[PDB]
Amino acid sequence: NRPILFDIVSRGSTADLDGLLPFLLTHKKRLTDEEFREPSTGKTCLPKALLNLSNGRNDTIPVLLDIAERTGNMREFINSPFRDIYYRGQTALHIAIERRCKHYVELLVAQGADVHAQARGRFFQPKDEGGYFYFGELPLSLAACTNQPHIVNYLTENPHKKADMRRQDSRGNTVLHALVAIADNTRENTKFVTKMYDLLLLKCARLFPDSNLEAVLNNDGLSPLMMAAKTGKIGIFQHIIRREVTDEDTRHLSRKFKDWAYGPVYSSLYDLSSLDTCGEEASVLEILVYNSKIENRHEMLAVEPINELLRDKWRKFGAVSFYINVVSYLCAMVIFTLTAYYQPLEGTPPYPYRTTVDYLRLAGEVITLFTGVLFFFTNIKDLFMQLLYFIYSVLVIVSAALYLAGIEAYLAVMVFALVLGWMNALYFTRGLKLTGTYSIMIQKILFKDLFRFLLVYLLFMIGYASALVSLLNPDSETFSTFLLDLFKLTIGMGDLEMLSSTKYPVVFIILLVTYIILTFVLLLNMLIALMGETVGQVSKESKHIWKLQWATTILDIERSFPVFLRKAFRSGEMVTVGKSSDGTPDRRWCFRVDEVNWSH
């Protein structure tokens, strides 16, 4: 009778249902029997009826509910979930809410519909995880994510059942987490996202004054603000960072207060407790600056307190430590250079020391080894809990070890270390503004475009030179010699005296001509062109890249210091902005900004 029932419900006709009650009573067959349910998914009668209706009025639902109550299977029938990978978990209430039918939502909850049921089927998953619509996996989160204020209002405060706002799905995300998860930078989306977020926050605070809704964290460990920063959602991040609440009852949770005004000058202090931390917990700034592949990484930093905080930190302690570090690094490299220079050529390593000058060389050596081990330890700690610096440190330590063992080879690698030691000194110009943007651009072009160009050139050059070598007739040694000669000719110095043994010299001349033409005219020119166009495309990006580089250097310096030193240098003044519900003072960290307005 399953096909007949499905046809009856799909049609929506009331008459066909007559007689089902006595039929079930006589045969004592429940509406959740395997035969009645569709084997493919598990869909029961109610979801099918709700799926296909007219102008929000199916007109069959009450009869189905009455029949199920007659049987006495409402508990297992009204909330019967779907099976299968695609739609697992989905219940009738999810459908009713998805179809924007308040009437049916009320009628469903009135009868005992499970309001906390989770719909974690593969249809409802994040876009990156092979899904279509992620909404928090809850009826309440669904209504909040589909921009339906009335549904959320009724659902939260209903006599029969209440879905508390502070509730977490399998992933741990709460309704605010989902509402940030579906946010997009479009104006239409943000306009309702912010409104619903604020409404829901105020309602939760009103109902429960003790707890805080944004305190909750998901399994990942983030909060709505940190998650919005991580997911690159400027629209809601900017509205949460400057949230101000005029209501006196709910002013405690506000984030931006007015401090004082004199004429056109207005001075307001922002709150940055969660925004900036000293190792107590993860900070928005660290996440936004250090994580990669963020949509609006550069735009997100242009917010009223963020930029001024970076500025104040830079003045307070950023500049001094940077100059100290660069000077010390240069001095250390000079000492290393002197040590390598004064390495005694005579004898074999290690060399005995029996004079004060020997002890001077030893002092330089120990300083260099200390620097190398320090860099190695810093990199290893970073890995456990700067690739070029890692190479420098590992090479230094290996050179010292081979010096201890006894072999000439160490000097080579030791010298190589010195090369790298200066090769990256340019990267310390990053902190400087005028030359730091140029250093960042040089590093960017060097790694991305120069890797491709070099890889393109290597095989071409080696194969073409091998072809020319094969052309000549009087053979690894011959190739080894000729390759040096050919590279020297590529430099523009030398002479092609080796062609005497070759037959058909004309074609060899032509081939060398074309080789030179390609190497100098086309290959070299394209490298020139690429730099010119990239800078033009990033002409505006120059300031963005510079600001990001400045931020990352400042944050690296801040991270390096231990916790208590950070406590000493922490920026912002403790300001008692009000008294909590119990009356005790807040005493919350804040940072002050003042502007000028001639229109207010």
Ligand X SMILES: CC(C)CCC[C@@H](C)[C@H]1CC[C@H]2[C@@H]3CC=C4C[C@@H](OC(=O)CCC(=O)O)CC[C@]4(C)[C@H]3CC[C@]12C
Q: What is the dihedral of CA 196, 201, 202, 204, to 10 degrees?
A: 120
Among residues 215 and 596, whose Cβ is nearest to its own copies? 596
Q: Which does 186 bind (CB under 5 to 8 A by kind): ligand X, its own copies, ligand XS9, none?
A: its own copies
CA dist list (Å): 307 to 238, 240, 279, 310, 313: 13, 16, 20, 5, 10
502 forms part of the interface with ligand XS9 (CB under 6 A): no
- Applying CB under 8 A, the site for its own copies has a residue count of 9
296 binds ligand XS9 (CB under 6 A): no
What minimum distance in Å lies between the beta carbon of 561 and ligand XS9? 9
Q: Interface with ligand XS9 includes 158 (CB under 6 A)?
A: no
Q: Is 598 exposed, middle or buried (0-12, 13-18, 19+ CB in 10 A)?
A: exposed
**Does 329 interact with ligand XS9 (rule: CB under 6 A)?**
yes
Task: Choose among 316, 357, 401: nearest CA to 591.
Answer: 316
Compute the residue count for the chain.
600
147 is in an annotated binding site: yes
**595 in contact with its own copies (CB under 8 A):** no
- Which of these, 91, 79, 84, lies nearest to 41 by C-alpha position? 84
Q: Residues interacting with ligand X, by CB under 6 A? A: 454, 457-458, 461, 480-481, 483-484, 487
What is the distance between the alpha carbons of residues 366 and 368, in angstroms, rounded to a whole number?
A: 5
258 has which bridge partners?
268
3-state secondary structure of 596: strand
Which residue intervals of 430-472 are DSSP H helices? 433-471
How many chain residues are in contact with ligand XS9, going by CB under 6 A? 11
Task: Decide: 73 and 30 in contact? Cβ < 8 Å.
Answer: yes
Binding mask 370-389 for ligand XS9 (x = CB under 6 A): ----xx--x-------x--x
The answer to whether 561 contacts ligand XS9 (rule: CB under 6 A) is: no
Least distance (Å) between residue 41 CB and its own copies: 25
129 belongs to the binding site for its own copies (CB under 8 A): no
Separation of alpha carbons 146 and 224, rounded Å:
18
Dihedral angle of Cα 277, 278, 283, 285, to the nearest 10 degrees:
90
Residue 195 touches its own copies, criterion: CB under 8 A: no
Nearer to ligand X, 418 or 461 (CB): 461
Token pair of 563 as six digits: 């916790």
Q: Which stretch binds its own copies (CB under 8 A): 28-36, 187-195, 265-273, 464-472?
A: 187-195
The residue among 388 and 517 lying less far from ligand XS9, judged by its C-beta, is 388
Question: Which residues are CB-neighbours of 412 under 8 A, at least 6 positions away?
Answer: none
Cβ closer to ligand X: 211 or 481? 481
- Binding to its own copies (CB under 8 A) within 132-161 occurs at 147
195 is in an annotated binding site: yes
User: Would you count residue 56 as binding its own copies (CB under 8 A)?
Assistant: no
Give me the least distance between CB of 523 and ligand X, in Å please. Answer: 9
Instruction: Find out whether 251 is annotated in a ligand binding site.
Output: no
**Minimum CB–partner distance for residue 328 and ligand XS9 (Å):** 6
Calculate the alpha carbon distances from 568 to 316, 346, 405 in Å: 12, 53, 46
Amino acid identity for residue 580 in this structure: S
Contact residues for ligand XS9 (CB under 6 A)?
325, 328-329, 374-375, 378, 386, 389, 556-557, 560
Residues in contact with its own copies by the rule CB under 8 A? 147, 184, 186, 188-189, 192, 596, 598-599
Annotated binding site for ATP: 43, 48, 52, 87-90, 99
